[PDB]
mmCIF file of C-alpha atoms and ligand atoms in Angstrom:
data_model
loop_
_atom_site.group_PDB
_atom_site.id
_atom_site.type_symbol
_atom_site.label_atom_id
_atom_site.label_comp_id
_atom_site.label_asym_id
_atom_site.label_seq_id
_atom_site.Cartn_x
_atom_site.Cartn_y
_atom_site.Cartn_z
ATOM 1 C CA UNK A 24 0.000 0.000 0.000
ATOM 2 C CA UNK A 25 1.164 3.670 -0.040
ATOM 3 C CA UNK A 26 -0.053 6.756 2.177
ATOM 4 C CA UNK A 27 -0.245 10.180 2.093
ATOM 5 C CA UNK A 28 -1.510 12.531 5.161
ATOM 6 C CA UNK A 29 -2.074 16.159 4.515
ATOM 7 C CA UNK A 30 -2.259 17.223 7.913
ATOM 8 C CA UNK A 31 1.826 18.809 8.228
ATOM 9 C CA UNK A 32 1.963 18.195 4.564
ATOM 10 C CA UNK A 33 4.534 19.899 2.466
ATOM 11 C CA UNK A 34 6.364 19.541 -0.863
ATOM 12 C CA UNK A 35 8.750 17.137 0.429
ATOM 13 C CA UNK A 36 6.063 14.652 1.530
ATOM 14 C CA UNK A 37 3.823 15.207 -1.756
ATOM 15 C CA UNK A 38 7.026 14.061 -3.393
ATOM 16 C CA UNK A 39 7.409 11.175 -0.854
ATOM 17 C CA UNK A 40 3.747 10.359 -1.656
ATOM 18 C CA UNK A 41 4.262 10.573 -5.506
ATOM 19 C CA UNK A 42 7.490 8.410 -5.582
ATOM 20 C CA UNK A 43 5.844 5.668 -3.167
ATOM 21 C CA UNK A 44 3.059 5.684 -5.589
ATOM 22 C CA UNK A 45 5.363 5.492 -8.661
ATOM 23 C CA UNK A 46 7.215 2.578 -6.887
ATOM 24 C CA UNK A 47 4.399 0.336 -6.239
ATOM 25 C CA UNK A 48 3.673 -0.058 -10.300
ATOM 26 C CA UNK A 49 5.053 -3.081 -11.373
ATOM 27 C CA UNK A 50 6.927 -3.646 -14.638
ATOM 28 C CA UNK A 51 9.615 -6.305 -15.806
ATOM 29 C CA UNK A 52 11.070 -3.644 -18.675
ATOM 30 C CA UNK A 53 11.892 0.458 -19.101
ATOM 31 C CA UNK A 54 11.647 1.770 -22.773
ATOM 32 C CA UNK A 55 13.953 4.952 -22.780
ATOM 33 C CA UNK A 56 14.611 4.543 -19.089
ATOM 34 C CA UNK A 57 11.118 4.819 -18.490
ATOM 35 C CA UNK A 58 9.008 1.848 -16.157
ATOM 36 C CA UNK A 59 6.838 0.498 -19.127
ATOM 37 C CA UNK A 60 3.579 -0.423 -17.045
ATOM 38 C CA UNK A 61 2.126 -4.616 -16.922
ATOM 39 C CA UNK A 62 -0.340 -5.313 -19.967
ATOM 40 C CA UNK A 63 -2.321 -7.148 -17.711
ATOM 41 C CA UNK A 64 -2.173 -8.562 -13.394
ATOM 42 C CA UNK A 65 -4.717 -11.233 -12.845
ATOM 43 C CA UNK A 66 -6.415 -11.405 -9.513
ATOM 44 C CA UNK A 67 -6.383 -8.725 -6.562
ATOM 45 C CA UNK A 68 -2.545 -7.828 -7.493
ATOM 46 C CA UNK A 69 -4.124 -5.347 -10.199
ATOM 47 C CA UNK A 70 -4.913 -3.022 -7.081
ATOM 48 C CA UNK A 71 -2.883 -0.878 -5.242
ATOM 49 C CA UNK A 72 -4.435 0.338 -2.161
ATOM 50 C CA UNK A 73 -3.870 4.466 -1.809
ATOM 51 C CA UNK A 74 -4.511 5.646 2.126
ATOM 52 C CA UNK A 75 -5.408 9.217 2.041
ATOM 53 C CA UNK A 76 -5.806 11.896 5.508
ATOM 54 C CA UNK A 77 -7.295 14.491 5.052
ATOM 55 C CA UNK A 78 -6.161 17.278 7.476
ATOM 56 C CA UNK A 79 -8.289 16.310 10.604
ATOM 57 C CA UNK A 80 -7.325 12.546 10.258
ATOM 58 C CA UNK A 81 -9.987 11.330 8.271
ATOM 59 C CA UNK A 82 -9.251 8.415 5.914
ATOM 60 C CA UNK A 83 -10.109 6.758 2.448
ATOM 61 C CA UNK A 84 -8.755 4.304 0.597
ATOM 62 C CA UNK A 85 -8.370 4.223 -2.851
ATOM 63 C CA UNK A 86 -7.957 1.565 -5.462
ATOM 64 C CA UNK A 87 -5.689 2.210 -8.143
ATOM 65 C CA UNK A 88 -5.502 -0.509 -11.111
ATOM 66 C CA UNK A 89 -1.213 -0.692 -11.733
ATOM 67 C CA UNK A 90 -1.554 -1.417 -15.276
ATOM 68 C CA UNK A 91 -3.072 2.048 -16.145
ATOM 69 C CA UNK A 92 -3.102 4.166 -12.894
ATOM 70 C CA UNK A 93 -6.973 4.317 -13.192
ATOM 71 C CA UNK A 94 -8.593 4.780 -10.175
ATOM 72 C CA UNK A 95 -11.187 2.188 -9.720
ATOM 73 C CA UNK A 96 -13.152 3.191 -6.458
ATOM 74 C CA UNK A 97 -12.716 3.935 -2.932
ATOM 75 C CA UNK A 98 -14.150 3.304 1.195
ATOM 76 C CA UNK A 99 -14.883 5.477 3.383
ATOM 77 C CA UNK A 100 -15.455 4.268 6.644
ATOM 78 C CA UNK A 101 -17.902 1.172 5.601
ATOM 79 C CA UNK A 102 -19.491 2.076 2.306
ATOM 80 C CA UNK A 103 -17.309 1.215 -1.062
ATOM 81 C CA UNK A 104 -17.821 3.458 -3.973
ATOM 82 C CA UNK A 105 -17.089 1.892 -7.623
ATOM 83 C CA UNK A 106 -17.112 3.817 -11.195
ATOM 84 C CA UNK A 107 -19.960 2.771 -13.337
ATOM 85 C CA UNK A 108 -17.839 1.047 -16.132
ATOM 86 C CA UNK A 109 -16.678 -2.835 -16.130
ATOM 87 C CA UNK A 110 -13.195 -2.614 -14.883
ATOM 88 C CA UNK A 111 -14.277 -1.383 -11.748
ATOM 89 C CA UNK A 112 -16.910 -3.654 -11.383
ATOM 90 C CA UNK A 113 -14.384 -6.435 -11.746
ATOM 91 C CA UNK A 114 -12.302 -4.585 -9.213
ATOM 92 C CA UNK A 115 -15.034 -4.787 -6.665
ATOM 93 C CA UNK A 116 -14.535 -8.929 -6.860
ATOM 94 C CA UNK A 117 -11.253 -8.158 -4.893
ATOM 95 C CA UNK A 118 -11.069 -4.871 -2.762
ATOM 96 C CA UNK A 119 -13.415 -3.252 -0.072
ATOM 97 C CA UNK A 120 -15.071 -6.665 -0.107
ATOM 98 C CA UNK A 121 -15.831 -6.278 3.874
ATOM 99 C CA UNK A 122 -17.988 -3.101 3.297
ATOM 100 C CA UNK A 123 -21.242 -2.802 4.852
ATOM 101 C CA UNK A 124 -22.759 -1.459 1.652
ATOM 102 C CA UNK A 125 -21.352 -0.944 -2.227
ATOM 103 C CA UNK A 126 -22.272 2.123 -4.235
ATOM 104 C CA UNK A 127 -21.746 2.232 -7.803
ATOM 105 C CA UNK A 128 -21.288 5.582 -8.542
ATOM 106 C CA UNK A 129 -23.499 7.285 -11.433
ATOM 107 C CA UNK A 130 -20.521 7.593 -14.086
ATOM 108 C CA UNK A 131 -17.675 6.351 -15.459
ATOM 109 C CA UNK A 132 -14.580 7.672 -14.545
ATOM 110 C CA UNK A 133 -13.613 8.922 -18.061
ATOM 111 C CA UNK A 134 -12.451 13.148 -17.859
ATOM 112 C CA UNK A 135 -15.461 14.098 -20.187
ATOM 113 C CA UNK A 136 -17.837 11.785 -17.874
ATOM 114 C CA UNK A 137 -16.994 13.030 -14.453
ATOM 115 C CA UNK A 138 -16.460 17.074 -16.402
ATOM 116 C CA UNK A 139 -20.613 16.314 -17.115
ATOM 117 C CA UNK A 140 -21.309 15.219 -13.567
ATOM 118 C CA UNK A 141 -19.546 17.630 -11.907
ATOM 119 C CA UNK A 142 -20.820 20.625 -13.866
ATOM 120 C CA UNK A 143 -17.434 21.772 -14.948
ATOM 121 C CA UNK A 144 -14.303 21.115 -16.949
ATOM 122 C CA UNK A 145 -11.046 20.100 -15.352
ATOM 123 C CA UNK A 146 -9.607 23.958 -16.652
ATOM 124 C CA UNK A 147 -12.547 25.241 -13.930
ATOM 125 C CA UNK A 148 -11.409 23.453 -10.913
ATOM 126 C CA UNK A 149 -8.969 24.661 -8.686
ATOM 127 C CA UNK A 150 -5.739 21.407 -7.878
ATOM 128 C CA UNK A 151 -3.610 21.289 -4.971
ATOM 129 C CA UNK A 152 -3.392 19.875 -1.648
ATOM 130 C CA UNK A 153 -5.753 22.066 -0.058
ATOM 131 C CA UNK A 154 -8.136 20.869 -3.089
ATOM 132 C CA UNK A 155 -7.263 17.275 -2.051
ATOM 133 C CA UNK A 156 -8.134 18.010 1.294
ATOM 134 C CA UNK A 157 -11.239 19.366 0.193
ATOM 135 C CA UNK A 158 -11.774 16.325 -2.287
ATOM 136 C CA UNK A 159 -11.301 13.417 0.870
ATOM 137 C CA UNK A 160 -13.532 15.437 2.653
ATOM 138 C CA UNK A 161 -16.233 15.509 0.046
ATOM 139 C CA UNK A 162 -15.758 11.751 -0.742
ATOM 140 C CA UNK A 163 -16.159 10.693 3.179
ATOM 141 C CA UNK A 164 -20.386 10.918 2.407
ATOM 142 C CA UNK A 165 -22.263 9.864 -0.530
ATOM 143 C CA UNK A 166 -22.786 13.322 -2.935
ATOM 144 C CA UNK A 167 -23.075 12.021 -6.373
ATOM 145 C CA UNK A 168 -22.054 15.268 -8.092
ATOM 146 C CA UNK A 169 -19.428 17.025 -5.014
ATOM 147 C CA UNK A 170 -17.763 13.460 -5.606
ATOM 148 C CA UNK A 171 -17.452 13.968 -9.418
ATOM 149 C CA UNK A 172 -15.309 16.951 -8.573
ATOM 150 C CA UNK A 173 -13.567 15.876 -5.660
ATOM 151 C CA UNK A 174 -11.946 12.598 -8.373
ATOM 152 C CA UNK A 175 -11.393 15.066 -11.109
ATOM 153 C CA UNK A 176 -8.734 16.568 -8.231
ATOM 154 C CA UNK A 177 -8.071 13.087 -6.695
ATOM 155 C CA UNK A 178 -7.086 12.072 -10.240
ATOM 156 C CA UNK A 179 -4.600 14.422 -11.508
ATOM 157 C CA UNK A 180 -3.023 15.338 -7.716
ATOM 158 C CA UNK A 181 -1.987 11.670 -7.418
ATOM 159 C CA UNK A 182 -2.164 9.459 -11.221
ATOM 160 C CA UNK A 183 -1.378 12.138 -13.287
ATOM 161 C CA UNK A 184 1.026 13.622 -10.633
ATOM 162 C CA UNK A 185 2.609 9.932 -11.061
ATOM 163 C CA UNK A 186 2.648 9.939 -14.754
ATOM 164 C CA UNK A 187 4.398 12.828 -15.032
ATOM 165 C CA UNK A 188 7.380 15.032 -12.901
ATOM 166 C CA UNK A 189 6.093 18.251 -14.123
ATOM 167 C CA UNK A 190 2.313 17.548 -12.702
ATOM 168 C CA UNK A 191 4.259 16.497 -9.684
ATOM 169 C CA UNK A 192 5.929 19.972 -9.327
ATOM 170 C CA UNK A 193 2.876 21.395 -10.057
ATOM 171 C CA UNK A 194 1.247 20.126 -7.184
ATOM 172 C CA UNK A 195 3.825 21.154 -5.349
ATOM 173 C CA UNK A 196 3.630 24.380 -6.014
ATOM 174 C CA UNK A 197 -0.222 24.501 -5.498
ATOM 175 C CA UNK A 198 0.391 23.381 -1.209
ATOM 176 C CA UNK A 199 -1.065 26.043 0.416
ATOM 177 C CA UNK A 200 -2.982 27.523 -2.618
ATOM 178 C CA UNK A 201 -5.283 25.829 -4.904
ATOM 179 C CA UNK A 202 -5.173 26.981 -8.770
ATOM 180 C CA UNK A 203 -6.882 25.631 -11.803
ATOM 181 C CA UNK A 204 -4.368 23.261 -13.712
ATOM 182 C CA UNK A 205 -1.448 24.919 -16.225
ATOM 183 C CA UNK A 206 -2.774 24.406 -20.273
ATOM 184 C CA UNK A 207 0.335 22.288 -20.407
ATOM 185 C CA UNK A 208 -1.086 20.063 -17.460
ATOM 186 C CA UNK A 209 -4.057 19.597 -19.009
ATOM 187 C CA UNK A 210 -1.896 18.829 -22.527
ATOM 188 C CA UNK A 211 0.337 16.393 -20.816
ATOM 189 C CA UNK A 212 -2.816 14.380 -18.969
ATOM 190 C CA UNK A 213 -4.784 14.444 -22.667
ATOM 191 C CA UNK A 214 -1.248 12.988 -23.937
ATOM 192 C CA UNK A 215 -0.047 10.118 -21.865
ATOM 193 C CA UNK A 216 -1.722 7.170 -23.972
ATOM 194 C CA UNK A 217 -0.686 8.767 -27.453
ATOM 195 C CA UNK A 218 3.150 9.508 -26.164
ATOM 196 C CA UNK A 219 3.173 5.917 -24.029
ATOM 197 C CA UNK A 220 2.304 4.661 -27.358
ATOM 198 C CA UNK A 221 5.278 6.809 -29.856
ATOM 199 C CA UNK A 222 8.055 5.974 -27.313
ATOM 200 C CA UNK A 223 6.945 2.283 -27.377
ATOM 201 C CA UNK A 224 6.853 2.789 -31.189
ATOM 202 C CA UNK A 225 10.525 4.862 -31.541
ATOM 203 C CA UNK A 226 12.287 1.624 -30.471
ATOM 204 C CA UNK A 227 12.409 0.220 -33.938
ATOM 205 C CA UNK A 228 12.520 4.231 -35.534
ATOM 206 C CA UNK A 229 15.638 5.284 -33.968
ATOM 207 C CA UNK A 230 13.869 7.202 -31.367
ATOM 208 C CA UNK A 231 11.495 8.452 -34.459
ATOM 209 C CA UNK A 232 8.010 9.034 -33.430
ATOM 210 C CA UNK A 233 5.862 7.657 -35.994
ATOM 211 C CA UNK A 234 3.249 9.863 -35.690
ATOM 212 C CA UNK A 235 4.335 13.139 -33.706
ATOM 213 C CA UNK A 236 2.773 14.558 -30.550
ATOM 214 C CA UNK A 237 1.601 18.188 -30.012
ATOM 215 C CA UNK A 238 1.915 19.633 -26.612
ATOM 216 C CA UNK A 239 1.670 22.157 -24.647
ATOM 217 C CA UNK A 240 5.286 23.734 -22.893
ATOM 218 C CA UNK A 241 5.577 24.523 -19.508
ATOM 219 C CA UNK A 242 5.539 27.992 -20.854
ATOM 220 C CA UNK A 243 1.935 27.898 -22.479
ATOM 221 C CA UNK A 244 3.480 27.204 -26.314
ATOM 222 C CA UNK A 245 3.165 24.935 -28.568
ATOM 223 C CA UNK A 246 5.655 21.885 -28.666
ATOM 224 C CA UNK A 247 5.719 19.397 -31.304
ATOM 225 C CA UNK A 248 7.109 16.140 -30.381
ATOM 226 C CA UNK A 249 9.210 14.330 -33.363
ATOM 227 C CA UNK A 250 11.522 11.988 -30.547
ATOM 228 C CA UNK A 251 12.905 10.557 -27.596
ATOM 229 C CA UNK A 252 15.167 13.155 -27.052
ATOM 230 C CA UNK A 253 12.747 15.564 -25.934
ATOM 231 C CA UNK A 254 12.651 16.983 -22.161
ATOM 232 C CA UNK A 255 8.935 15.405 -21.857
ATOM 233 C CA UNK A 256 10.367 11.862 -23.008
ATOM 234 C CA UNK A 257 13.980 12.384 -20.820
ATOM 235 C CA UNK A 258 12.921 14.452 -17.706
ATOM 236 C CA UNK A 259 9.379 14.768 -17.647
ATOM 237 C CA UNK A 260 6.883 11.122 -18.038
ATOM 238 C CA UNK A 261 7.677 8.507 -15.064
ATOM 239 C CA UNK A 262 5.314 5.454 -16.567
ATOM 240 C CA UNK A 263 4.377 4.606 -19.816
ATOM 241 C CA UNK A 264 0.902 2.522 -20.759
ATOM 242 C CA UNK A 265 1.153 -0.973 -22.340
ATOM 243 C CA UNK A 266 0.817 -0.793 -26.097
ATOM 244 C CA UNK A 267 -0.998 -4.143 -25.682
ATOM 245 C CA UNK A 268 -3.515 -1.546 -23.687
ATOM 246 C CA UNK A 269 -4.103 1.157 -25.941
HETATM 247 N N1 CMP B 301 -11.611 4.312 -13.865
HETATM 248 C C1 CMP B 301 -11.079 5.300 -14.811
HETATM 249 N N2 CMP B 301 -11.543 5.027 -16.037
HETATM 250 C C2 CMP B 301 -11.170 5.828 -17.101
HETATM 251 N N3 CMP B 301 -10.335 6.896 -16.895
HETATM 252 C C3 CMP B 301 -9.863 7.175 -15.632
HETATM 253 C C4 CMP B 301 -10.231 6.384 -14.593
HETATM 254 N N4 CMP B 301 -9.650 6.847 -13.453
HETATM 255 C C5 CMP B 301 -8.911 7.930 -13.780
HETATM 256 N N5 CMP B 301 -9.034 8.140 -15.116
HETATM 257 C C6 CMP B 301 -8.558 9.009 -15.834
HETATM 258 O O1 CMP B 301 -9.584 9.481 -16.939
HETATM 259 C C7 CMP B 301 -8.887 9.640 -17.990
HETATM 260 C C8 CMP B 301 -9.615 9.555 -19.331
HETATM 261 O O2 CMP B 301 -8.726 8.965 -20.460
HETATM 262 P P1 CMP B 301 -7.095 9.433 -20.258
HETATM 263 O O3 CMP B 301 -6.220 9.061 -21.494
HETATM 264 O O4 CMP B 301 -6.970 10.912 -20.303
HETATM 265 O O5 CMP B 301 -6.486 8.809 -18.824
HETATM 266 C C9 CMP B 301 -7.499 8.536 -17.854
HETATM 267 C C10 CMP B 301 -7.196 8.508 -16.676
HETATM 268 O O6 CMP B 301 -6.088 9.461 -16.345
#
């Protein structure tokens, strides 16, 4: 399992948080020097168990499929809470079984889904650790469309934060003041499968994307992405999706 408490929280223990989180996602291979993620785990291994405090010392746990880094569902206290879409349903097979009581929430947890649910894009909602505070609170008791929210922040201030160093520091930056999420945040989470997928591809093209990436730079600009020579392919990604998944 992994943990993170935000109650004395600071950058340093965000980082902690994000490189225990990294670490528990198996792989047998790196592709550039990057962890190339499981195509498949059978059986309750899929699931790594995420323990989040919010800043009074109230707990969920979150389950976190290691092939992909999607979050499947969560407890709180002794009601489970599942996406509405078949992977999580499988999930629910093997964690949280000893719950008094399992909700499957009314979406999937697809971006555009939970946007819908919650009323707002992800460009609209303030990320950070106070937001993740907010966010365990909110998922502690059943609100259908707070919770869509609070896992659009759960989402990108731990997976996305795991995929990828920059989202990390961005986090980081955002520990004692929310903001809405950087255009090249947003750019980078849009982009994981496609550039997982062109570094897989680039060994056998010299480092040659077949098809090149556009992104957005750190400083709001356009960046087209030919190879594996890049700063988002040497410094920046941390895990890379199974082709055999996309
Ligand atoms: N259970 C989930 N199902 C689908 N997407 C999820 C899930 N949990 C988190 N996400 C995120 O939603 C996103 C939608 O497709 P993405 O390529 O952007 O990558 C995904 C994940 O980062």
């Amino acid at each position: 399992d992994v943990s993170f408490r935000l109650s004395g929280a600071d950058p340093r223990s965000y980082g902690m948080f994000i490189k225990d989180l990294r670490n528990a996602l198996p792989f047998r291979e790196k592709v550039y020097n990057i962890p190339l993620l499981l195509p498949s785990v059978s059986g309750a291994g899929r699931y790594l168990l995420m323990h989040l405090f919010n800043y009074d010392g109230k707990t969920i746990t979150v389950a976190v499929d290691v092939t992909n880094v999607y979050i499947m569902g969560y407890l709180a206290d002794t009601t489970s809470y599942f996406f509405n879409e078949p992977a999580a349903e499988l999930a629910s097979q093997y964690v949280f079984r000893d719950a008094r009581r399992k909700i499957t929430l009314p979406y999937s947890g697809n971006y555009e889904r939970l946007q819908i649910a919650a009323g707002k894009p992800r460009e609209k909602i303030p990320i950070g650790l106070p937001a993740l505070d907010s966010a365990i609170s909110t998922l502690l008791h059943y609100d259908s469309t707070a919770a869509a929210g609070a896992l659009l922040v759960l989402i990108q201030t731990t997976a996305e934060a795991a995929r990828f160093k920059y989202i990390e520091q961005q986090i980081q930056e955002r520990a004692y003041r929310d903001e809405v999420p950087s255009l090249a945040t947003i750019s980078l989470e849009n982009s994981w499968s496609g550039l997982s997928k062109q570094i897989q591809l680039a060994q056998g093209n010299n480092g040659i994307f077949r098809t090149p990436i556009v992104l957005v730079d750190n400083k709001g600009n356009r960046v087209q992405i030919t190879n594996v020579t890049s700063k988002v392919v040497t410094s920046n990604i941390q895990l890379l999706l199974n082709t055999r998944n996309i």
